[model samples]
Target: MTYEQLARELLLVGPAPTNEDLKLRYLDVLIDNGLNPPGPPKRILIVGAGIAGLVAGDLLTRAGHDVTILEANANRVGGRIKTFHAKKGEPSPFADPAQYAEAGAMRLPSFHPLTLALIDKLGLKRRLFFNVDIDPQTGNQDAPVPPVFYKSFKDGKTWTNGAPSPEFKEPDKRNHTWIRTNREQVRRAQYATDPSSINEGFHLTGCETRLTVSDMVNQALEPVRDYYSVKQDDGTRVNKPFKEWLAGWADVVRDFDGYSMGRFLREYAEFSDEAVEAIGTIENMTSELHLAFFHSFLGRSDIDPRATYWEIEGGSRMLPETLAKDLRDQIVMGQRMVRLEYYDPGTGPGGPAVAIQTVPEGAATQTWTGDLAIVTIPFSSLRFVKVTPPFSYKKRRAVIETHYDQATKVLLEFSRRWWEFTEADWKRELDAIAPGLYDYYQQWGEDDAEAAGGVRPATNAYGGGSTTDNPNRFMYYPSHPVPGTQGGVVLAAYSWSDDAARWDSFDDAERYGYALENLQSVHGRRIEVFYTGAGQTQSWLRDPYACGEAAVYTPHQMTAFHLDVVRPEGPVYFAGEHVSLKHAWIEGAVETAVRAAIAVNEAP
Candidate 1:
């Protein structure tokens, strides 16, 4: 963590020859009118057909290189950007034909120019993906679409793909959602006013000084913000002058790179154990407590709470699928890479051709050779690949020890968008399902009976989600309903790290049943009446191709070999979320694509 190393590393996306920010150049490379490399063509083989692999293939092919892509999945192309939606001919997951849900990579944030601009280049429709639930009472119409916008830091130049959009209206924040912990349930609005109920449930001595869990966490992290940015008069943070910003970041890496998030909170921030657990339960950091402090800290600022996030009209998968359409023939499917070679000593003086061999769906001997290659596979999955010459010491350690988090989702279907329904709406819909069902739920249902003063109250909130200490740690209501159908899919449980690994032992049936019970404990048993029974379960740790959800650094992993992860070992280079600081994001993946393609195109 030397100052020189930190500064040099700080500039990964630093600047190009033109001296503008690297993102502006990368954006140009992906846009239609962007310039192509003047270098001579070379045969290139790309691994994995994820956004990174696909974008690299597109960039290289367009730049006049001979390009081929190999994907492990025969049935699909988008690697982790998968959606479990209904297909016309196939049996639908829900009772209705139109209902569907995201299994991976759902929303695109405004700060991410690479993915945002790429979305416009491909002409796929996108709308506001509500991170917080919109008010059901206010102007409830969906917000109008605004063009993607990015302002360059280097020259202060702005970039856009379309003209002025209509006046953007941010819907009012609704706080009717529930936050349940330790058998205590409180409405979100009420919790903000008096958090003592849930806070006391944790036996928190720290509760005396805390107003809310969010502010407690925020005030502690404010010290870290002093490094690279200063809070402006308007409450917005602006980065220090460029030179100072870089040095400040370098200092941050050198000083804090060694601390895991748990240690940072306990030892550095000196938060009480009671305060830690209370924050851990609601803030969704308990599972990743032992991972990198840099990761958790950066994530807090990266996705600003006040910022806007957009989702594709259908699903995030459309962006990848749209890119996949033209590259179909160039991609070989169902061939997992088991062996890779960048340098061979036994060859003639001309030396090794980048070679890769895969286990094919059919034994056609799927060995591919190219002058250059880009390895985009996750390091966890890459561990099994037998290489001719071993990778560099740092690269080898990265491949072996880069910690990946497990993320699993338990998705369920409903016969109605019951989250947006009030008592009157509930009374009307329940009678339709079965006469006297509403009263039955009101009077009966074990100990979780209705309207018992936060015992079992109606959660008529729209769009946002709920939090609980139950096995189903979190539940998200669909921000928008599927047109022509009353039912919508709800994310019953989306857990990460050890919390996600909790459901791995159980099969889908048990997982769903347990998830249903947990959901009932939080949202009440009445929700099950709308339950469609059919659902989707996505476990990234269990996925053979994606060994874990995404690369999350351990305490020292970031400072140890982050620079090495993206470096080339001879002709084989690397790309993907694992190779970038912005882990588990398409922006990171696509950023690597352009950088790798540009480097490969100019290579000797």
Candidate 2:
């Protein structure tokens, strides 16, 4: 099929063999709250009890189909939607047992209807996830949070969890986050008004020195954005007609599919080396520069300054828990799938159409059979699983060649929410910790830089995150405190692609200390006093089951094999975040789950 033909499938306009409206179908199942496909019951087995597996199983079981989920982890079920909170008698990840932080999934963009709808359906309380820090003195903190709202792109019909609340008010965004690069630092707001403050460190030349990196990149990307969207009089962009929009995206996949972000920025976009370095470091792009530009391009809308996002009141894990609560007994733990076999016409008749062999963590190998199955584990791990009959060439190549980017995170618990401290608040809090502690830090701050190994100015921010050229790459503070606890957990070190691979090599025990030091370099050494000495880390690349983060594509992978990725083979189907264009998102996982569930439930 041509790229244009494939793009139709990708956009779901000409989706599936029968042209089923997957968007409306999905709304019927997830948002409308039921899956009642007309079919007889079939025993369905799902490999990997992640968001994809759990959602598929729950919906199928609800409609009277016998379903089971095989999970590699013996104790947990949420997969990437994991939290550091105590569970199944395990100890908490901090000194204050009352405090918790996200170990895996954190924020949900307002654009993802499936993820947001499911989260609301579960009755979990959610609040704004401050992608940018919020002002301490402004906005209504006690007002009701606005409900989830999604307007379909296919049509104007909208879906919502509840009516818009008059009492709801989103906190004001405060660009107090730090941007550190080339050992130079500037607050985000300061950099917005004075680009040269940090741009000079990169020695950026020409127009790049005067414009903010974000604006420069946006200008660079304007031509591409013009492919499908038109710039309005107000400078906002609106999509072209639906037909032209789809055609434009196909053109994007066809033309730019082969370029990495680094190449595109340098060669196509004509950004200088210094500009790329300066923009990449401050804007969280340098780490994955060599990866496919499409990933970044397609995801631009979700992280834009205009986007709104949410985080569960407790932790993201609660969203997955609601789906797994009723299906506990059916979800078998400690079962790591080792082999997959399906009935083939060329071979003799088998006992079951689909069978999965697993070697339990501490027990003998076992096989479970079902009429049909869905493999929800990452392709990186699936690469090792043996299949009886050969999969099609496209599927085989994808399993072996798909590039899942490395993602590593280091979470640390602070005894207090020190990131919120003002200069006076710092004086009071530090002196409370120990007399002269306030003076001790001030003596070394930026003014005394050389003597204190380059002490940083205090980053007096509430939430959001900080970007740096340091090994840690990124640091995020909690948007809201874990209720009943004075202290909070901070995502001290978060990295992706090459940045993550650097951290993946270190032993888990060693990374936390270095991450804290890196955090100190940005927020100042005084924060060390609030350190609770408790931390948690995860390297998706090193994980036995995940092997790597979601399929983050490279060069032509999307145009080459993304269509075949979700295709079914015999009695087996596939579903995961990797299968969706919105990779590394919960909605991506949920979308595939619903699609695979519908296919499995209705198939003869």
Candidate 3:
């Protein structure tokens, strides 16, 4: 088992430190016990200085392997895990001097033990993320109260404390109600003595199953859905057991693999227009892929479905920055990989088995040779590099077919934290609600004309600090630090999928306007008054080194092509977030890096 697994087991068996602390202890135990690969060190080359590459490089180097890492970007170390620091004299963009803008990967879920372990190892500080419920310990009032307002659309309707407002009765809809209801039903079923108490909608009829909360509700639901009767090509309906239906669905998913998430959700589930729009910002998936992922997530025991989230004290970039700092000399920056090739040393004195060619800007090409290579670059970036003695058909397909999600963050610095100052009665209502709640909206187009042109800039502030002008005010529970205490920065727009594509189409100045206009419509405040500096925006899809934010699988891609992507190609091993079970996360990158390092050590 991995150190994380052992650490968790330790928690169950005896008194232990936080899972984060236990992780570092577990790694130390392994290192002290000499459990790492035993042999003369191999010359290991790791491409990409992202989390996966850095982790692999660190572990192997510590284990006595000669390791070298090549990163394409000259200026920054972290790839998608980056935070842009506001310059000291940058002047006010928002009300306060902005310290940092998390350009990518802002929130770190508490359930991620490995990630937490690394942060603790580096002695980094983390603050509770936005939406964390306040308790007595946090210096808040005795009673917990949510602190934000929300509207579904500009003029469509409003919801306070996540419940529909007095005015929005016709639809009477609330955010995430369906998801919460499903979880509650599952929780009830898990402990129910009589299956009837669990509710027929939640209990599976065909299966004689003992309900358990440890198992996710959706996990139970998936088998039932799969086993239910469905029409074949001839329109003949039939039912099958879970295993049989799974095999059948696997085949069927391949046939519909190309369908987008929107198509899949529309065809398979009954989602209202609002839910569909909300999901567009939530994940990047094709229908089959999303269905599998959503259900799997519902069943995950490691994660608390109801738990609040957390973030680093400084920014998400701290973890990577620290990791890179520790492995300073091993990393070469500004060298872009142009070609990679594998060679098998059957009986040759020239024992190097892998060759990597990289070029620095306005500099001569440099070639690096190693006994084994661990490539951690995203497949989106890797697809461009020439590979000699071509990859196998399956590997080729995995490389070309893996899809990456698009994301863009248009962050704006505002003059003040006006969100904290809602109407007087509104503040009273907010105080009565649950802690960490904020105003949320589905974002119906404020301007149909602008939206028609294919741009839909929107904001879900998450949370922000009061501006220097309003320094005495503390509107939200958890606050990101703003430099110089002038005006504070609020994320003006955070979007994904098609919405991101549209926002990305605009230039930085235009994107700022989009954020300004959309937010202005929501708050009924002149955003222009607070705007103090040029904004920052990044589209992962457009970055040359990172063509996409995260890699995603289609319906059959996991079973059919995932192994091919992870399998070692001769002396070349693969490691990246894409190759991990936890794709699009730092945890995935770390996990894959460890696996690749082990594979390299074990290789003959």
Candidate 4:
């Protein structure tokens, strides 16, 4: 029953191997064709019951291999794809900060293929979230809100108050004309539209002549240019470098960068490489559109921005749930994966075999044995879960090389649509309103409501209001553009990038307080009781299972080991948002899992 008692039972499994004992030194030999001997049915162990692991388990199970899932959490098996809606009038008060009303993953767009397939297979009815827009109180659909733009004068200067940005904005001047003059300017292509570069310009200096788009493209793409094969208009296939093709045809490439990456270079790379290399960079026009779409969607709804954004018809929870449902019969929650080892000539148990010890409070310590272990644990949580016989220099360096975000979401439950009241506050104080005061609100209908003071609302639509007597409602508050809040809109404060080393310096409480203070600065109101009700916060970055919300990889991280990390490794496999190839939304979890499952089924 006691924590120490439970750990003792697990520690009895024998001392875990050290990072050196489990180094992956012999991996090259295993792939050498004749060096390793074949053996019994490959025992595959999936460490997390999230979408990726479940999908892999399903396929491996079907392939007649023994597949087991060791999940760390007690209840939900879907990883972060947790849906916590209570039945009508159920006394489901949001007790823990994580249990607050703010919705997690929102809608799944119709464009996602893997998600669409899984939804059909699971038989979950797909509904357009935007179309219904139902009111929680009356069950009557709410009216669509027109996007509004306010041009206000601040300190004698005019500033657009959350105006609807053009569906597309042109890249900055430095990049705008560089691509035109020299296609080589593709090196600076990514800098074109990043919000970071909105006010900055390129610092190109060392050039023989003025840089050409070709020169820039060549220089910028030197890292990945060779991986693709190009063809010419004539039957005589272009047969040249990717940089050359981009240079010559850059003018004719409208939406060329927008093509689905899966088909863009199928003939060029291996299946795994295809997924790794196919990712479009931040400079890609689609990336720009998605950013614009995020802004456009914001001005048109009353939903809380604290929650991560996704299309509504299929709320984001769809994908992870689909994968979890597929493996509903197999997962054993509450087991922790403590250590991993692989057989490696260079590294030696310090070579290539991983052992994950999962024993909580008197529970039996279960071990997973694998020649190859695909460690999918996020870098945020990896620091605590040690590997025995210790990770190799390369593996250890790889772990250190990983990065995470500073995503913190604060969800507010109001006695009423306080934003409606705050709207009056904004109007009366519009003269004093600062640049980032209030933005928008989302409605949660009764179907989405949780019980308040023992009284349940008619609707539970998060961000949407309930018609019942209960005054509780929820919305997702995203911490974006910058950390802090304005008026009613809460932001998830995150500071991440290549230079994110200090995140671990702050203790959990210190980080939470630091982020919360940022919120109070703009609101200047007592947060413990925002209105007639209380509010809570969820810090994804600090959570043990999830260090950050779903991830978005930089251009460089995608190149080296992304796919190799995702592949199913004997009984040890990987899963979650980090490994998904498409729709990093909730669907990625399902898609990544399906691909892992497929690999497990077909593995030698």
Candidate 5:
């Protein structure tokens, strides 16, 4: 190809590609030219069988690179993308056509184009993540409880909404006020008349290599103002953009970086200890980190506000299973990478090869060599591996200082679809009850239940609860109203962070019992009546292969480490959810993998 044509083709992959077609074309061009090397392709060693590693291997192999993937776990791929299936023929007691649980990465939002593109590439059918509808009354009752119940164990009280119980009314109001005030401030700032004025106020002139945290926040805010600013009636003032409020929220959180999320909520958001603690159970980090995370995923669509949550037709595991199937002999399971040694061109005895030391279970240690290595293992596992030619100070610090959140999932099977029947009946009753008949007093409107008992109506399904106060953090139902399914599966508990630790403390049986008891109390159903068979539980934190589910950035991790950690160190490169802005999602892993694959393919 001519220089101009080659340059034009290269431009297709710069920063962001319009579509997968262009991305693949650009990479193909790199491979066609000697830029990616021809003949017997260069040996590429990939660590981990997770999404990142899987995608990297898939792409590099397709690009005619000699790629080998090493996975620590035996007989399985899909690191965190686990699905617990229940069928009649399975060894487990619970087995039916509809019996399946997503132990990790259950939902996919529409904004995650790379993940969506990958799913399409693998020919996996997509379906709505039907379980997430929060509407209490209307839905297929055959589905799990969409209704949520809020509970405050500190005072042994429960409510339908997120408001605190009677004991913490004052604290709740204070918290609410703080949340309202800050939200208003953010809203006002979002719709400020002149983004240029605020841009100037921040004293940011032009592009710079490094930015102070304040500069970063202001720079981020300018986009928010430009997009969300609206004119008021009579053109008096710019009205707030209600739909874009969440998009602007990141700047607000970024403004309060160092403070712990709980502390920030209490001090600036006027949140109470209970409120802060409750949120902490779900997200264990500082306010800035949480907001940084929030902005990373949530603020994508200023126009399309709703999340397009979806999942594979069968289970999330199909993603990696498909990749592993395509990879075939390239993947080596039960092989643990212990160390990486990158030798400079002249310093090494042999030509520039990165040495990889690995040990298989019950096998002697062996060393492997590759022209390049893509380390996709989670930091939790990576921290133990020795690097002969150590990373830079910043890289080492990022590797050591990065935070990883613990997560656990409990899958339970029942004799029948009890939740489906129960939810249907509850919906019927709820539909009959006239709106406003319950009134504020009737529905926990007064302080005491005795006074409110006379006007109160029958309850259906419990809607929400705080994991911080209860053992059973979250429940998910699978089966989706399909016919001929004998029994349904329940994600009895999906706990994260500290809450996961609490549930992880209990054994399978104990956890089952605890989850059942709490579920019954919330639904006011005799859970024993419908209970049938035992279930299984998986804790990512406890898994030797995966010490944590996903990398979680805390406070300064964004500014201090994200950039440094992702940078390629000689022949060694890093790819995973940790390396991308979108953590705890397959999108992050896939995006990073694509980027890393390109980096490796284009490497000299």
Candidate 6:
């Protein structure tokens, strides 16, 4: 490519946004002034048909622009936000074929204006409802209650299995807003109260706070020997804060320390004023919904006062299917982007267009053209794809400085329902060295009476139990890759990132192996021998499309920057969880896409 050809004819603002304000302020002026040829709407080519791409398509399409979304996957629509069915005789934790299982981006917070607006636009008000995981499986009278499960990806098998809650201090003005806003005991008590006990104070507390940001995190450090009964098969036990346990297994944790869900939460919990204000109302609500979702993403539901929890009448009804189906027409799946080159339409010899090459099925080489392309592919994948002219030192360093976290979830299936035991009993008996494993259960059948107390049968041996959706579905937050550091080590399996260096290093098997060994080491149950089928695992950082998940932020990062990143670049633009302050959460994804669509529609 000639130097003039590479003259930055079209600026590609991605990974983050630094040019939105400039574009938004000028695009409309340029449009209304009749500055262009004024023939037809601009021809916009969207890359990577994820949420961001779909949003761009919607706006451009409405603007009367010619739009075509090129995805790296097989379908012309939809990305990770998928739903599938699990037939009987299939894995136990698997969803029944009749039921359908959600693969990514589930649940939208009630506070997301754009998401709510989109729901209304699609007339999904009747179909879209909050996810209520209330079932009798874990809350049943027959099986075990499983120690108020609350584990994130970071804790893994080293999870501290117990129900002893940190003393709940009543909210006070002196307390940080983060603390008060998140503490939601008033609402929790309503559902936590016991059904059988006649005493007024009696309650059935189903507490769960799960995070899946990254594997092995610092917050999971081990306490002093006096704190926990965590043990290994050799009879050796971890007797310290959860963080200490992670430190002890540094190599293991680091191996899977791609990005940390815990770190993201910490930074977000302490966002700056400029960041918050710059985020504006839509962005602010976006942050709030995502925060609640991520904070309580473990196996259980969150009970924070500020959290506005809602549920679909028949369970998490609209989450998996409707959203994915609607966006299908716009998404360009399985079209891997191999290269990026810039060219100005009139300034350059060939005119302005971001030339992109892709490897479609059965094709050795293929190419497409667009006015401008929004390169939202994960940094890891970007690092792999050859970008002509290459990124500058600062941009490269930023890519290095920014990273995604590693996370995995393993669900155990059983032939019969096992929700008879008490929560206290499971706390004492449950085992998993990796930190977030549990024996929580859930209800299955439709009838409340048949649902083992209106719950499902689930023994969350992987992450913590419910904290977000009341009565069932434990969630674990505060995840990481081993306590203090960001590196490797996994028991039953392992997955790692070279900080965006080695883009294609490992596969699903290696990742699962690390987790498997860790599980066996922690539980000493010889789990490797019990292989009915492969376990469930999701490592976002390595995913070419979504490098990280659940809106986990890094040090010094701001939420405003996230919204800004969604601003359009020529015909190209950015969106998805990365562009969201709360990256991995469903609501954040929705909020990010709405902002991206708006930016694209109004771009000059």
- lDDT tens digits, residue span 1-604, model 3: 2222322221211222321333333233223333254556799899999988887887777778888999999878889897767445656333344446677887666555556656766677665465422222233322322211322212243322223224321111112101111212221122334433332333433332343222323332343344323545763345554335434444333434444344544554444333343232222222223534422332232223444345777778888888888798899999999999778542124767888999894258999988889999999998999997788789999989887877777777755544433344333433444332223212221333222121112222324321110111111212554545645556666655555666677776777766665554334333354467667778899988889878866544665666567778888889888886577778667766766776786666
lDDT of 6 at 61: 61
| Candidate 1 TM-score over all chains jointly | 0.95
lDDT of 2 by residue, 302-385 (tens): 225568888987789888888899797789999999999988664226567888999976448888998889999999989999
lDDT of each: 0.81, 0.83, 0.56, 0.38, 0.58, 0.37
Write candidate 1's Cα lDDT for 107-157 as tens digits.
788888889889888888777777777785565345556777888767478
Flag regions of model 6 displaced more than 4 Å. Answer: 1-40, 75-77, 84-95, 123-306, 310-331, 344-352, 388-397, 415-417, 420-535, 557-571
On TM-score, who's better, 3 or 6?
3
Which stretches in model 2 have alpha-carbon errors above 4 Å? Answer: 14-21, 301-305, 346-350, 444-455
Pick by TM-score: which candidate is best?
A: 2
Give the higher-TM-score candidate: 3 or 5.
5
What CA root-mean-square deviation does each model show from the true structure? 2.7, 2.3, 14.1, 18.9, 14.5, 18.5
Model 6 gets an lDDT of: 0.37
TM-score, cand. 4: 0.48
- Writing each residue's lDDT as its tens digit, candidate 6 over 1-604 gives 1111111111111221232222222222222221232334566667766555665455556556676677776642445554333434555333222223233444555443344334434434322211322222232222322221222223242222235334422121111001001112122222223211211122212211121111112123222112223545764454334344323333222221222333333353433332222221111122232222222232221122233232222223343334445445555556788887656332135565667788874268677776656665555556667655544444554445554554433333211112222444333434432332343322121222110032222222211112211111122211111223222111122222221122234454444443333332222232332333444445555455665543443432322133234444344455665555445554445444545555545556
360-425, model 5: which lDDT tens digit per residue? Answer: 953588787889899999888999999977787899998898888878887777765545444444
Which number leads on lDDT? 2
Residue 318 C-alpha lDDT in model 3: 88
RMSD of 4: 18.9
**TM-score-based ranking, best first?**
2, 1, 5, 3, 6, 4
